[PDB]
Design a protein around this motif. Structure first.
Motif, short mmCIF file in Angstrom:
data_model
loop_
_atom_site.label_atom_id
_atom_site.label_comp_id
_atom_site.label_asym_id
_atom_site.label_seq_id
_atom_site.Cartn_x
_atom_site.Cartn_y
_atom_site.Cartn_z
N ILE A 181 -22.04 27.65 -20.31
CA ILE A 181 -22.07 28.25 -21.64
C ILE A 181 -22.88 27.29 -22.52
CG2 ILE A 181 -20.71 28.82 -23.69
CD1 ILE A 181 -18.51 29.83 -22.10
N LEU A 182 -22.62 25.99 -22.38
CA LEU A 182 -23.33 24.98 -23.14
C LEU A 182 -24.82 25.05 -22.80
CD1 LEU A 182 -23.48 22.44 -24.96
CD2 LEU A 182 -23.06 21.10 -22.90
N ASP A 183 -25.13 25.16 -21.51
CA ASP A 183 -26.52 25.24 -21.03
C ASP A 183 -27.28 26.35 -21.76
OD1 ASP A 183 -25.86 23.26 -19.18
OD2 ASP A 183 -25.77 24.63 -17.48
N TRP A 184 -26.69 27.54 -21.81
CA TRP A 184 -27.30 28.69 -22.46
C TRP A 184 -27.58 28.39 -23.93
CZ3 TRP A 184 -26.85 32.08 -26.47
CH2 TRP A 184 -27.62 33.25 -26.39
N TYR A 185 -26.61 27.80 -24.62
CA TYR A 185 -26.79 27.46 -26.03
C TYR A 185 -27.85 26.39 -26.25
CZ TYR A 185 -23.17 30.50 -27.72
OH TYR A 185 -22.45 31.63 -28.06
N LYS A 186 -27.99 25.48 -25.29
CA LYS A 186 -28.98 24.42 -25.39
C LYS A 186 -30.38 24.99 -25.20
CE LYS A 186 -26.74 20.05 -23.97
NZ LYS A 186 -26.70 18.97 -22.92
N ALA A 187 -30.49 25.99 -24.34
CA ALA A 187 -31.78 26.59 -24.05
C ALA A 187 -32.19 27.71 -25.01
CB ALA A 187 -31.80 27.10 -22.63
N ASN A 188 -31.23 28.52 -25.43
CA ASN A 188 -31.51 29.65 -26.31
C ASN A 188 -31.11 29.43 -27.76
OD1 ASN A 188 -31.98 32.16 -24.16
ND2 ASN A 188 -30.57 30.59 -23.42
N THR A 189 -31.02 28.18 -28.19
CA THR A 189 -30.60 27.96 -29.56
C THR A 189 -31.16 26.68 -30.16
OG1 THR A 189 -28.72 29.18 -30.50
CG2 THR A 189 -28.42 26.78 -30.22
N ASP A 190 -31.11 26.61 -31.48
CA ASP A 190 -31.60 25.44 -32.21
C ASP A 190 -30.84 24.15 -31.87
OD1 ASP A 190 -32.26 23.67 -34.69
OD2 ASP A 190 -30.16 24.22 -35.00
N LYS A 191 -29.52 24.22 -31.92
CA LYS A 191 -28.67 23.06 -31.65
C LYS A 191 -28.68 22.63 -30.19
CE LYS A 191 -24.30 21.40 -33.57
NZ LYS A 191 -23.13 21.87 -34.39
N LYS A 192 -29.08 21.39 -29.94
CA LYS A 192 -29.12 20.86 -28.57
C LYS A 192 -27.95 19.92 -28.28
CE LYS A 192 -33.04 22.99 -28.36
NZ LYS A 192 -33.34 24.21 -27.57
N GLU A 193 -27.40 19.29 -29.31
CA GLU A 193 -26.27 18.38 -29.14
C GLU A 193 -25.04 18.98 -29.81
OE1 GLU A 193 -28.62 14.70 -30.51
OE2 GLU A 193 -27.24 13.83 -29.01
N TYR A 194 -23.89 18.86 -29.15
CA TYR A 194 -22.63 19.38 -29.66
C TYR A 194 -21.52 18.37 -29.48
CZ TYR A 194 -24.69 24.09 -29.47
OH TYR A 194 -25.48 25.21 -29.67
N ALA A 195 -20.67 18.23 -30.49
CA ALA A 195 -19.53 17.34 -30.41
C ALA A 195 -18.55 18.13 -29.55
CB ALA A 195 -18.95 17.11 -31.79
N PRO A 196 -17.70 17.45 -28.79
CA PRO A 196 -16.72 18.11 -27.92
C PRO A 196 -16.03 19.33 -28.53
CG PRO A 196 -16.60 15.80 -27.55
CD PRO A 196 -17.52 15.99 -28.75
N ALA A 197 -15.46 19.16 -29.72
CA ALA A 197 -14.74 20.25 -30.38
C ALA A 197 -15.59 21.47 -30.74
CB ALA A 197 -14.02 19.71 -31.62
N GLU A 198 -16.90 21.29 -30.89
CA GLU A 198 -17.76 22.42 -31.23
C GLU A 198 -18.54 22.96 -30.04
OE1 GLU A 198 -20.45 21.10 -34.33
OE2 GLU A 198 -21.38 19.57 -33.05
N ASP A 199 -18.30 22.38 -28.87
CA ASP A 199 -18.97 22.80 -27.64
C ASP A 199 -18.57 24.26 -27.39
OD1 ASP A 199 -19.03 23.36 -24.68
OD2 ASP A 199 -19.86 21.35 -24.60
N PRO A 200 -19.56 25.18 -27.35
CA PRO A 200 -19.36 26.62 -27.13
C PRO A 200 -18.43 26.91 -25.95
CG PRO A 200 -21.62 26.20 -27.67
CD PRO A 200 -20.99 24.85 -27.42
N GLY A 201 -18.62 26.16 -24.86
CA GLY A 201 -17.80 26.33 -23.67
C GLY A 201 -16.36 25.93 -23.94
N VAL A 202 -16.17 24.84 -24.69
CA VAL A 202 -14.82 24.37 -25.02
C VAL A 202 -14.15 25.41 -25.91
CG1 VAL A 202 -13.47 22.65 -26.28
CG2 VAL A 202 -15.26 21.92 -24.72
N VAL A 203 -14.88 25.89 -26.92
CA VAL A 203 -14.34 26.89 -27.84
C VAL A 203 -13.94 28.14 -27.05
CG1 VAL A 203 -14.87 28.43 -29.78
CG2 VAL A 203 -15.70 26.10 -29.79
N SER A 204 -14.81 28.57 -26.15
CA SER A 204 -14.56 29.74 -25.33
C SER A 204 -13.25 29.60 -24.57
CB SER A 204 -15.73 29.95 -24.36
OG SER A 204 -15.49 31.03 -23.47
N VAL A 205 -13.12 28.53 -23.79
CA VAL A 205 -11.91 28.31 -23.01
C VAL A 205 -10.66 28.19 -23.87
CG1 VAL A 205 -10.75 26.87 -21.29
CG2 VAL A 205 -13.19 27.36 -21.07
N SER A 206 -10.77 27.50 -25.00
CA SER A 206 -9.64 27.33 -25.90
C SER A 206 -9.12 28.67 -26.41
CB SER A 206 -10.01 26.43 -27.07
OG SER A 206 -10.41 25.15 -26.62
#
Length: 316
Positions: A181-206
Motif C-alpha cells: 500500500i505504501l509502495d503505491w502511494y510512494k509511486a503514485n503520489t506526491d508524498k514519498k516519506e511517511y511517519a509510521p502513524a500516517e503510513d497508508p498501509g498502517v492506517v488501512s490495517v488499523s
C-alpha cells in the motif's frame, strides 16, 4: 529486552518465509509462504532433497508429464510446509495457484488437493491455512472451504470492501497488506516519506482491525508485507503479524520495550447487512490503489508459479 520479545506480549509473531533457518532463529508461532517465497526457497541448496522427493513422488502418481509437473509443483510446496511444521507449534500457510484467482470452483478444487497432500503426509487441517487472493471469487471459495473444515488465509487484501467481504464470509484469517500500500502511494503520489502513524498501509490495517473487533468478527487479522519496523511497531496489538526474517532480525537487535498501539476497548456492535457482489465491486473499484495492487499481486504470483513449473519440468 529486545523489540521482538516485547512484541510477543501483544502480538503473535509469524515468520514470512519458506526458509527453515528463520524458524529456528525466531521461534514464530506460525509461518507463511506464497508462490514467490516458494520459488525462492527452491533455490536453497539444502532444499534440493525436497525437490527430488517431490519429483520422485510425482512420477509414482502418474505417467503423464502434464500431471507430473502439477503434482511435483504442489508436492514441493507441501514438502516445504512439512519441514516448517517440524519447527513451529502453529500453522503453515500454503497458497493455491494464483492463476485460479478468478475461478471459485477451480480454487476450491485446488485447495482441497493441497489439503489432500498434507493429510497424505499425516498432517491434519488444524495445522494448515490455505491461502487465496481476496478477489470476490477467492472469498466465495473460502466461505465454502471453511464450511468443509478447511481454514483459509485471505491475502492480497487492500480495500475496505475486501476486508468487509472477508469478515462476512467467516474466513479464519486475513492478511491485509501494509508495505505494498505504501509502495503505491510512494509511486503514485506526491508524498514519498511517511511517519509510521500516517503510513497508508498502517492506517488501512488499523481501520480494518477496529472494524473487525467492533463487530465481534472472529477472523484473525494478520498484518503482512512490511517495508520497515516502524509499520510493525505502529501495529503492536494486531492479532498476528507475519514478518520477513530481515525485519525479524531488526526487531531482535533493537533494545527497548514498546507500547501496544492497536486496541478496541468498547463493546461489540451489531453487524450490518451483508455486502453484495455489486456493492463489493463498486466499493473495491472506488479505490485506485486496491484496484492496481490486487490485480498486480495476482499477476506476479502467477508468473512465479510458471517459473517454478519451468524448473520442475526440466527435472522430469
Amino acid at each position: 529486552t529486545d523489540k521482538l520479545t516485547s512484541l510477543r506480549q501483544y502480538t503473535t509473531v509469524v515468520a514470512d518465509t519458506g526458509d527453515i533457518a528463520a524458524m529456528k532463529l525466531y521461534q514464530p508461532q506460525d509461518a507463511t509462504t506464497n508462490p514467490s517465497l516458494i520459488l525462492n526457497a527452491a533455490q536453497i541448496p539444502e532444499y534440493r532433497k525436497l525437490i527430488d522427493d517431490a519429483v520422485a513422488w510425482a512420477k509414482q502418481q502418474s505417467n503423464d508429464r502434464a500431471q507430473q509437473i502439477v503434482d511435483a509443483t504442489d508436492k514441493l510446496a507441501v514438502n516445504i510446509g512439512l519441514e516448517i511444521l517440524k519447527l513451529v507449534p502453529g500453522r503453515i500457510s500454503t497458497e493455491v495457484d494464483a492463476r485460479l484467482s478468478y475461478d471459485t470452483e477451480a480454487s476450491i478444487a485446488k485447495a482441497k488437493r493441497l489439503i489432500k497432500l498434507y493429510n497424505d503426509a499425516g498432517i491434519s487441517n488444524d495445522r494448515i491455512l490455505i491461502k487465496l487472493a481476496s478477489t470476490w471469487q477467492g472469498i466465495r471459495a473460502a466461505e465454502q472451504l471453511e464450511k468443509e473444515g478447511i481454514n483459509c488465509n485471505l491475502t492480497l487484501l487492500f480495500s475496505f470492501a475486501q476486508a468487509r467481504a472477508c469478515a462476512e464470509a467467516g474466513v479464519f484469517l486475513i492478511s491485509p497488506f501494509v508495505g505494498r500500500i505504501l509502495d503505491w502511494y510512494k509511486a503514485n503520489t506526491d508524498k514519498k516519506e511517511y511517519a509510521p502513524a500516517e503510513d497508508p498501509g498502517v492506517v488501512s490495517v488499523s481501520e480494518i482491525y477496529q472494524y473487525y473487533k467492533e463487530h465481534g468478527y472472529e477472523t484473525v487479522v494478520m498484518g503482512a508485507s512490511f517495508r520497515n519496523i516502524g509499520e510493525i511497531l505502529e501495529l503492536a496489538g494486531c492479532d498476528r503479524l507475519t514478518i520477513a526474517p530481515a525485519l525479524l532480525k531488526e526487531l531482535a537487535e533493537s533494545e527497548g520495550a514498546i507500547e501496544r498501539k492497536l486496541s478496541y476497548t468498547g463493546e461489540v456492535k451489531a453487524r450490518p447487512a451483508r455486502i453484495t457482489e455489486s456493492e463489493f465491486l463498486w466499493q473495491h473499484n472506488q479505490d485506485p490503489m486496491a484496484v492496481d495492487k490486487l490485480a498486480e499481486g495476482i499477476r506476479k504470483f502467477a508468473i512465479d508459479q510458471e517459473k517454478l513449473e519451468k524448473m520442475i519440468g526440466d527435472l522430469l
